[PDB]
Amino acid sequence: THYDFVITETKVTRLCHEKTILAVNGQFPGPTIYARKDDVVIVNVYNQGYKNITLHWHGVDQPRNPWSDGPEYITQCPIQPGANFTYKIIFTEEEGTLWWHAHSEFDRATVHGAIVIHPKRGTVYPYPKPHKEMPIILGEWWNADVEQILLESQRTGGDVNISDANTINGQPGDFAPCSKEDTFKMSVEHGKTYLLRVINAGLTNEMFFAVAGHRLTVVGTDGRYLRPFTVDYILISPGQTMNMLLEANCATDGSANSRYYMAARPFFTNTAVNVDDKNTTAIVEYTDAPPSASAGPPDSPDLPAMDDIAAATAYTAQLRSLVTKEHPIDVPMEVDEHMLVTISVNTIPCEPNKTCAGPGNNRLAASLNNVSFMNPTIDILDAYYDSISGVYEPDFPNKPPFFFNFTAPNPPQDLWFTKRGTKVKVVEYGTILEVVFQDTAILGAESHPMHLHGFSFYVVGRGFGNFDKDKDPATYNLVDPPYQNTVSVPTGGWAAMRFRAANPGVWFMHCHFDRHTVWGMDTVFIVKNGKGPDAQMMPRPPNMPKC
Ligand SMILES: *[C@@H]1O[C@H](CO)[C@@H](O[C@@H]2O[C@H](CO)[C@@H](O)[C@H](O)[C@H]2NC(C)=O)[C@H](O)[C@H]1NC(C)=O
Ligand SMILES: *[C@@H]1O[C@H](CO)[C@@H](O[C@@H]2O[C@H](CO)[C@@H](O)[C@H](O)[C@H]2NC(C)=O)[C@H](O)[C@H]1NC(C)=O
Ligand SMILES: *[C@@H]1O[C@H](CO)[C@@H](O)[C@H](O)[C@H]1NC(C)=O
Ligand SMILES: *[C@@H]1O[C@H](CO)[C@@H](O)[C@H](O)[C@H]1NC(C)=O
Ligand SMILES: *[C@@H]1O[C@H](CO)[C@@H](O)[C@H](O)[C@H]1NC(C)=O
Ligand SMILES: *[C@@H]1O[C@H](CO)[C@@H](O)[C@H](O)[C@H]1NC(C)=O
Ligand SMILES: *[C@@H]1O[C@H](CO)[C@@H](O)[C@H](O)[C@H]1NC(C)=O
Ligand SMILES: [Cu+2]
Ligand SMILES: [Cu+2]
Ligand SMILES: [Cu+2]
Ligand SMILES: [Cu+2]
C-alpha cells in the first residue's frame, strides 16, 4: 500500500523523434497502482523534473480529503522542482479500473498510468474470474515538447496543434513511421477469457475501439460494475475507463489467423477543424498456433467511421449500472436543487497591440454558463480553509444568464464571446443536485466529456437538441442509470445527472479535453461541512506546497 513516484526527465523515442518527457520512475505510461476495495494507498511524489507539477487519482472520491486530490490551483499549489509531496488515496466505493495522471497544464500527456482496484478479500467479481487482465491505455504522442505545444497556443490564441499519433500503451502501432517493431502485443490462449481494462488517457478525442474477430462483453466503467452487454466496438471518452471481457475462441489449428488487430480511432464530427485521425493498433496473438497461421497481416476490425454519430449514440445508450444485492444502487429520487449548465467553446477579445489566431482573429476560450474559468494564484482549497478574500467568488450560477436556441447551428458572431472569472458553487453537505449539461452550437456542436472530482454520479437522461425541463425528466432512467465520473454529453445535446453532495471539500468539475480545461470549461463545487465528524473536511496536512 505504499508507492514512490519519482517525476523524471526521461528520453523517449517514438515516430523516430527522440525527446525528453516527464515520466514517472522513467516509465511511459507510468506504473500501475494496485489496490483492493477500501484500501488506503500512500504515494510519495518526488518531483525531480524541470517544472511545477501535480498528480491526481482520477475517479477516486477522496472522502473528506481534497488535500490529496491534485488539480493545480484548485486543491493545491504545485509541487515545485526538487520538492516532494505525499498523497493519501482513500478508496471506498470504487472497484474496477481507474487511473492517475498529472493535473497541471498538459503534463498528463505523458504523466499517467492505471489504477486497478480488485475485489477485497472474501469477495469476488460478479463475472467468472478472468484468466488474465491487461490495462489498455489509449493516448496521444506529439513529437514536439508538449509544454511548447501548450505555450504556443497560449501565445497565438489559436487552436492547439493536433497530436502526431494516437497510441496504445504508449505505442502508435503497426501503421505509423518507426513504430512497427514495438507495437504493443498481448498473448492469448484458446478458450481463455481476458479482462481488458481500457482507459482513455488522451487529451483530445473520444475514441472508437475494437478487436478484430472478437466481441467484447462490457462489465464495468469508472470503478462501477455495469449490466453486462456484448458489442463489436466501444466508445470511450478521455477520463473514462471501460472494462470488458474478451473470449479467445478462434481456432489455433492453422485454419484461422493467429494475430488480430486491436484498433482505436477518434469519434469526431467537426469537418472544419483539424484532428489527429490516425488509427492506433496493437496485436492479439494466439501463441500456440503454427507459424503458418501468422504468415499474413493480422486481421483488422471494422471501426465506425470517424463522424458516425449513430454508432457513438448506440454504444452510450447501452450503459446501465449493475444492480444486485452484492452491488446495490442509490439513485437520488427527490432533487433539492436543479442546475442547467451550458457548455461552449468561445472567444474573448485579442489583447491590445497583438493579432490572435482564433476565430475572427480573437483568442479561443471556453465556458460553463458563460463563465470562462481562470485559475487563481492561491489555490481555492487554501483560500476556503483560511477564509482568504479576493481569490474566488461563490456565485457560479444555476442557469445560463441568457436563454437562446442553444443547439441551433451557426449562431451569430455576437454569441461567440465569453467572460473570464473564478466562480464556484457552494452547497450544504448532503444537498441532492440534478446537473443538466447543455452543449451549445457556438463554434461547433461537439460532445464534451464532463468530469466531476470527488464524486461519481448517476446519468439519468440524455438527448439531442435543447433540454426540456418539463418533458425530458419524464423518461429519465431512475432505476439503473450508469454510475460514472465522466459523462459524454451528446454532440449538440444534453445529459442529466444526479448525486448527493456528501463529500466535504473543494471539487473540480471540468471538460476532460485538456484544451477546453485550460480555455475555462470548468467550475468548482465547495461542499461545506455537515454535522458530525464524518461530515467534516480533514485538516490541512502539515507540508502542503506553498503558493
Ligand atoms: C457571454 O458573456 C459575454 C461577455 O460578458 C457577452 O457578450 C457581451 O454582450 C453584451 C450585450 O449583452 C455586449 O454589450 C458586450 O460587448 C459583450 N461582450 C463582448 C462581446 O466581449 C455574451 O453575450 C454572453 N453570451 C451568452 C450569455 O450566451
Ligand atoms: C511554480 O509554482 C509556484 C507556486 O505557485 C509559482 O510561484 C509563485 O508565483 C506567483 C506569481 O503567479 C507569486 O506571487 C508567488 O510568490 C510564487 N510563489 C513561490 C515562488 O513560492 C511559480 O511561478 C511557478 N512557476 C511557473 C514557471 O509557473
Ligand atoms: C520532502 O519535502 C520535505 C519538505 O516538505 C523535506 O523536509 C524532506 O526532507 C523532503 N525529502 C524527502 C522526504 O526525502
Ligand atoms: C504547430 O503546427 C504548425 C503547422 O500547422 C507548425 O507551423 C508549428 O510549428 C507547430 N507548433 C509547434 C509548437 O510545433
Ligand atoms: C489504419 O490506417 C492505415 C492507414 O490509413 C490503414 O492502412 C490501416 O488499414 C488501418 N488499420 C485499421 C486496423 O483500421
Ligand atoms: C497599439 O494599439 C493602439 C490602439 O489600437 C494604436 O493606436 C497604437 O498605434 C498601437 N501601437 C503601436 C502600433 O505601436
Ligand atoms: C431551434 O433550432 C432548431 C435547429 O435549427 C430548429 O429546428 C428549431 O425550430 C428551433 N427552435 C425554435 C423555437 O426556434
Ligand atoms: Cu481526470
Ligand atoms: Cu478526476
Ligand atoms: Cu469540452
Ligand atoms: Cu480532473
Q: What DSSP line would sit under 489-536, residue for residue?
A: EPTTEEEEEEEEE-S-EEEEEEESSHHHHHHT-EEEEEE---SSGGGS
Chain-centre distance for alpha carbon 249:
32
Helix/strand/coil (H, E, C) string of 55-108? EEEECCCCCCCHHHCCCECCCECCECCCCEEEEEEECCCCCEEEEEEECCCCHH
Is 402's C-beta closer than 6 angstroms to any atom of ligand 1?
A: yes
**Cα 221 from Cα 319, distance rounded (Å):** 9
**Cα 244 from Cα 319, distance rounded (Å):** 13
For residues 59 and 95, is the Cβ–Cβ distance under 8 A? no
Distance 58 CA to ligand 8 centre (A): 5
For residues 522 and 510, is the Cβ–Cβ distance under 8 A? yes
Distance 293 CA to ligand 5 centre (A): 21
For residues 106 and 203, is the Cβ–Cβ distance under 8 A? yes
Is 355's C-beta closer than 6 angstroms to any atom of ligand 6?
A: no
**Cα 520 from Cα 346, distance rounded (Å):** 9
**Contacting residues for 174 by C-beta, under 8 A, at least 6 apart:** 180, 183, 261, 281, 283, 298
For residues 414 and 513, is the Cβ–Cβ distance under 8 A? no
* Amino acid code (one letter) for 65: N
What the block records as the C-alpha cell of 265 is: 480511432
Q: How many CB atoms lie within 10 A of CB 365?
A: 26
Burial 499-518 (b: 16+ CB within 10 A, else e): bbbbbbbbbbbbbbbbbbbb
Chain-centre distance for alpha carbon 99:
9
CA neighbor of 509 nearest in space, from 341, 323, 262, 312: 341
Q: Name the resolution in angstroms.
A: 2.1
Given ligand 3 and candidates 84, 86, 544, which is best to mutate, with the most ligand atoms within 8 Å of its CB? 84
- Evaluate the omega torsion of the peptide bond into residue 29 and state whether it is cis, within 30 degrees of 0: yes
In this structure, the chain runs to a length of 547
In three-state secondary structure terms, 409 is coil
Given ligand 4 and candidates 154, 159, 161, which is best to mutate, with the most ligand atoms within 8 Å of its CB? 161
Strand 40-47 to 2-14 pairing: parallel
Alpha helices in 319-432 (DSSP H): 380-386
Q: What is residue 386's DSSP assignment?
A: H
What the block records as the C-alpha cell of 85 is: 509531496
* Ramachandran class of 377: left when φ > 0, alpha when ψ lies in -120 to 50, beta otherwise: alpha
**Cα 106 from Cα 94, distance rounded (Å):** 26
Return the residues preceding each gap in the chain, C–N over 2.5 A, or none.
Answer: none
Q: How many CB atoms lie within 10 A of CB 24?
A: 28
Helix/strand/coil (H, E, C) string of 171-195? ECCCCCCCCHHHCCEEEECCCCEEE
Residues flagged as binding site: 56, 58, 101, 103, 448, 451, 453, 510-512, 516
The protein residue whose alpha carbon is closest to atom 8 in ligand 5 is: 175
What the block records as the C-alpha cell of 501 is: 453532495
**Cα 401 from Cα 76, distance rounded (Å):** 30
**Cα 252 from Cα 235, distance rounded (Å):** 30
What the block records as the C-alpha cell of 344 is: 461552449
What's the alpha-carbon Rg for the chain, to the nearest Å? 23
Beta strands in 349-454 (DSSP E): 363-368, 371-373, 419-421, 424-427, 431-439, 448-452
Of all helices (H) and strands (E), which one includes residue 311?
helix 309-316
The residue with cell 490564441 is 157
In three-state secondary structure terms, 472 is helix
**Contacting residues for 130 by C-beta, under 8 A, at least 6 apart:** 193, 194, 195, 245
Experimental method: X-ray
Chain-centre distance for alpha carbon 102:
12
Distances (CA, A) of 6 to 9, 185, 381, 394, 546: 10, 27, 25, 36, 20
CA neighbor of 237 nearest in space, from 135, 315, 169, 170: 315
Q: Report which bound ligand comes closest to the CA of 100.
A: 8
The C-alpha angle with vertex 503 and arms to 84 and 83, in degrees rounded to 5, equals 5
In a 13 Å sphere around the CA of 495, the CA atoms on its Cβ side amount to 22
Distance 110 CA to ligand 4 centre (A): 19
Chain-centre distance for alpha carbon 161:
20
CA neighbor of 495 nearest in space, from 526, 471, 465: 465
Q: Report which bound ligand comes closest to the CA of 349.
A: 1
CA neighbor of 431 nearest in space, from 545, 325, 517, 535: 535
Q: Is the dihedral of CA 290, 292, 294, 298 positive or negative?
A: negative
The C-alpha angle with vertex 194 and arms to 188 and 195, in degrees rounded to 5, equals 145
**Cα 545 from Cα 52, distance rounded (Å):** 11
**Contacting residues for 535 by C-beta, under 8 A, at least 6 apart:** 429, 430, 502, 504, 529
Is 279's C-beta closer than 6 angstroms to any atom of ligand 5?
A: yes
Distances (CA, A) of 38 to 221, 454, 467, 531: 18, 16, 38, 24
Given ligand 7 and candidates 404, 405, 407, which is best to mutate, with the most ligand atoms within 8 Å of its CB? 405
The protein residue whose alpha carbon is closest to atom 12 in ligand 2 is: 377
For residues 197 and 219, is the Cβ–Cβ distance under 8 A? no
* Amino acid code (one letter) for 530: G
Is 391's C-beta closer than 6 angstroms to any atom of ligand 5?
A: no
CB within 6 Å of ligand 2 — which residues?
52, 77-78, 80, 377, 546-547
Is 543's C-beta closer than 6 angstroms to any atom of ligand 3?
A: yes
> Which ligand 5 atom is nearest residue 261's CA?
13
**Cα 282 from Cα 166, distance rounded (Å):** 11
